[PDB]
Every structure is written in structure tokens, then in C-alpha cells.
């Protein structure tokens, strides 16, 4: 066990420790159960935050016991990063002595807000904070350690259908993990592989919970994933194909656009490369193309993190900041995005019940009059009109039978990414939910 968590010094109120362990070391196998044990013996009420629901259930079948309680009494409470944020949004007011966050390097807005609130409470000597990442925020090294040898070579990677020139992709007995910047490009890569006689399973933010099990049972030749596999995913592959690209939303002229690709950060590229090299006695491959880019300040994920964090803090209490090496990404002074309590209830309803983004939920709950108003979805500018991939305008009918055209006043392209996101937003705009 690492010396930072030997003894009892890591549980002292105000202590902040970072556990850099390359994958395959025993973070969830030997370290985390030992950290839980020391806190149960001392009656220290603890909080354990898991990144994904898949990570939560894997820790559930191993740590469920007498004094452990899994969410969405006991001493240890375990929940997701978003669960801690959403429950804290309801004035729902519990405290803890020690906090442990697994995979605390996620740039998801809820993960950034959870880091900020726990870091701020630890600065007030109200709790202790432990962070567990192979790529801690601030460190920039694209080739970290691993249990097995990893051969990194740069070669051109196709972003779509290829005729010839890439025979190294098919001529390889073994299982490969291919990272793509978006779902749309992942479907095109699956077309070229399946046409050439290869088994493919696609993993994205909307298919990860249902088909993560099929990777173990079906043993596919390729796994086309969209960065959802960076956060605690055991794909059991020996080769990683990574173009180091990523499609992330930005704010441009009061609108969230999803156009173009950006270079991934060093932590993301190292996290993709960490999918292999987890067992010695063999050599895995990591195929990349291009360099990295650690300047992701232009992404809207940093603004939405402060929107959540400013509405997370307790009333008549100290404001909260981001985590240490991350406060350079703060858009405004701490506490700027604070909303009134009545406006906050509408903000919480849009996130949990309507599946809005933190960006869109903030602008709606802070500028509309009634909570049952739907006019803002068809009263916006003509420029904000929404269309499908066939060119047809999105049309829905209000309860009075009037066919409307979707022109939101606050346009967020993430809400119109696919029919799965369109029909849920159309169902809201039409008044069905």
C-alpha cells in the first residue's frame, strides 16, 4: 500500500491526498477496500463517489455489507458523481468526515463540480479528500506507466471508409479498441470493419450501460468507443487505435455548437492508452496520429461546472471554488451563477426530470416567467431553427393542434444531437413532459 494512505494521517480533517496508480495495480481491488476498513473501525462517516453507474455496481457486488449504503443509518455512503451533485441541489443536506472520489480526472461538468465542492470543504477543515487517478489534473505525460510493455507507434488512421493502404488494421490476430471523436464517425468505422468481416461493438454515452457486458461475453474483434471508455472500462484488448480527436461543445454567440473536432488533452490520450498494458509477459500496441492539446478552456464544460457548483453550496455559507490545478478554468468569480431558491427548483426539475444540459437549464429557469411555459422553444430567431439530417425542419404540434417550428431562444446543439435527444426535447416542447 502507498505510504500516503498508511497510518491515519490521510483521514485528518483538511488533508488532501492524490493516489497515482497505473491501471492494474489494485485501486478497486486492494486499496479501496483497505481505505473503507480503516474508516469503519474509527466510525468516520465517509463518502465514496463513482464516475459511472457501471463502476458503482462493480464496487457494489464487492463492498455491499453491514455499514455500507449505495444510493440511486450506515457509516459509508457510496454514490455517483452526478448523484452527489443532484442531491445537494435540493436544500438534502448531509455531511461527511472523509471523501473518496474514484477516477477524479473526468472533465464532465458534474465531476468538476464534485471536485470543487469537496476541495472547498476540505479547505474549511470540515472533511478530508482523497483523489484516485492515473492522470491527476495538472500533470501532462502522454505515456504513463503500466504493468505490461506498450509499443507506441505513429501511423495514419482513417477517419472513415478506406479502400486500400491500411492492411495493418485487418491483418492482426487480436482484439483492438478504436477510439473515435463522436458517435457519427464511430458508425462509419463499424461499416468498414463489418464489411471486411470483423466483429464490432460500439460503446458511447448512450449504449454503455446496456452493452458493456457484451464485450466480455461476445469477445469482439473491435470495440469502437467514444471516450466513454476512458473512465474505468476494462475492454480486455491488446491494441489501441487512437486518432487523438474529440468533439466537444463550445459557446459561440449565445449558442452551444457541436461543429468540428479538437485535439484531446494529454490526460485523455494517456487514459485511452491505459486500456492496454495491464498484464506483464506480453507487449501491447498503441497506435496514434498527431499530438495533444492541453488547452481545453474554450469548452463549455467549465462554465456548466460552475453553474452547478454555485447552486450546490449551502445558504449563508462560504462560496466554493474549483479544484486547485483547475481554478484557471473558472469563467467568473465564485458564486456568480447563484440562482434564487424558487428559480433553483425549476433548474433542478429541468436537469433531473427533463434531461437538460446545465447550460440550457440555467438560461431557462432564470429568464422564463412560468414553469409551464413552452413558447421559448418556438419564439427564438430564425437562425436558431433546428433541422434533421434530411433537411426537413423539426415540426411539432402544441396541445391546441397548432404545428410549430423548433426555434429555441437558447440553442444547445447537444439537445438536438439525435432523435433520441430530439424526441425527448420535442416531447417537452409539445407539453407532453
UniProtKB/Swiss-Prot annotation:
Span of the annotated motif DEAH box: 102-105
Q: Where in the cell is it found?
A: Host endoplasmic reticulum membrane
Q: Which residues carry this modification: N6-acetyllysine?
A: 206
Domain annotation Helicase ATP-binding: ranges: 8-154
How is the polypeptide modified once translated? Acetylated by host KAT5. Acetylation modulates NS3 RNA-binding and unwinding activities and plays an important positive role for viral replication.
Q: Where is the Helicase C-terminal domain?
A: 164-323
Functional summary from the UniProt entry: Displays three enzymatic activities: serine protease, NTPase and RNA helicase. NS3 serine protease, in association with NS2B, performs its autocleavage and cleaves the polyprotein at dibasic sites in the cytoplasm: C-prM, NS2A-NS2B, NS2B-NS3, NS3-NS4A, NS4A-2K and NS4B-NS5. NS3 RNA helicase binds RNA and unwinds dsRNA in the 3' to 5' direction.
Q: What is this protein called?
A: Serine protease NS3
